[PDB]
Amino acid sequence: GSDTITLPCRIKQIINMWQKVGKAMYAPPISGQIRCSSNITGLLLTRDGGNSNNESEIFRPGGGDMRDNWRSELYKYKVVKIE
Amino acid sequence: TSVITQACPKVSFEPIPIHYCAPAGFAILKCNNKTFNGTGPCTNVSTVQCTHGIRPVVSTQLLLNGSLAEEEVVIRSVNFTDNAKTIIVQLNTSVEINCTGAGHCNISRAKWNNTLKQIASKLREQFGNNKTIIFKQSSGGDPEIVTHSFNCGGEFFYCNSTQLFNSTWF
Amino acid sequence: TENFNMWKNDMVEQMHEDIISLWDQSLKPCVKLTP
Numbered sequence: 001g002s003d004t005i006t007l008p009c010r011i012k013q014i015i016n017m018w019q020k021v022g023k024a025m026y027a028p029p030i031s032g033q034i035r036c037s038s039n040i041t042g043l044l045l046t047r048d049g050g051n052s053n054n055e056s057e058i059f060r061p062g063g064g065d066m067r068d069n070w071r072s073e074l075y076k077y078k079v080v081k082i083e
Numbered sequence: 084t085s086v087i088t089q090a091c092p093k094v095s096f097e098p099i100p101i102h103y104c105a106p107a108g109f110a111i112l113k114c115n116n117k118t119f120n121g122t123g124p125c126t127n128v129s130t131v132q133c134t135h136g137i138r139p140v141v142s143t144q145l146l147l148n149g150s151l152a153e154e155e156v157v158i159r160s161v162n163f164t165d166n167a168k169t170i171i172v173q174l175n176t177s178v179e180i181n182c183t184g185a186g187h188c189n190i191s192r193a194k195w196n197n198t199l200k201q202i203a204s205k206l207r208e209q210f211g212n213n214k215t216i217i218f219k220q221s222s223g224g225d226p227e228i229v230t231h232s233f234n235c236g237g238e239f240f241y242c243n244s245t246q247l248f249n250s251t252w253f
Numbered sequence: 254t255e256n257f258n259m260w261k262n263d264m265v266e267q268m269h270e271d272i273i274s275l276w277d278q279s280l281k282p283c284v285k286l287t288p
Contacts, residue, residue, distance in 0.1 A: 004190065006246075007187060007242045008242070011184060011241070015227065015232075016227055025091070027092070027093055029238055030093050032184070039147060040178040042147075043146065045169070045171075052164075057207045057214065057215070058219050060220055063144040069141065070139075073135075077103075077111055077114075078114075080110050082105075083108070
């Protein structure tokens, strides 16, 4: 009928930075109605190895290099030197 | 080992579509090939003053609020052979993921299982004629890597996604 | 026409630095980085 994929989620305050190799801590929430509605537009995967060209291929979620996030939008572009 | 104590403030982070235009004596060349696939000699192409409305969303394993493929699901990687390299996937249709600070994110079961078989219709083998495609979840590593981490309403969410990547197809 | 593009950039390195510098001005924490 209306089967939805419920994913357990957690709000952390101490995080490993994505900018550079660091750690950061933010204040706890103040709002009691944090609400987001995003549109999955993609996926960033990775494949299991040691089974090259064989019958199965395992693919797991990935991410981490935020560059790979800009790359998905900028792929079709390029800067050429103009006179 | 630099520690910095700033007046940690409760602000609200909002994404402003960022347009990137031509930098100095350079020119931006947009490839118009509806299904341009990464590296290669783009046939249909043209100069532009600025790219397009790019929404800088920081998050893991799931690209959100961005550009979709206008034709079919297109994947891209530097080397589809080296298992160590990230494979980006551009989706055909958008999927929704509604989340709240109350600890959960729900996404339609049907909508997402469909995109999975679509992505499955072309994995590593390279749109391979056929073989078994398996979706498992993260092997391990940082919380931001092992879970769909993102900044929702200013706060940092770490959504457990074992349920999105745990299935088998052919 | 008939040009070349790839898994390199345009604004990948640029944008990355704009966004890193955008986050800094916005979401301020209490940082800790290792030199």
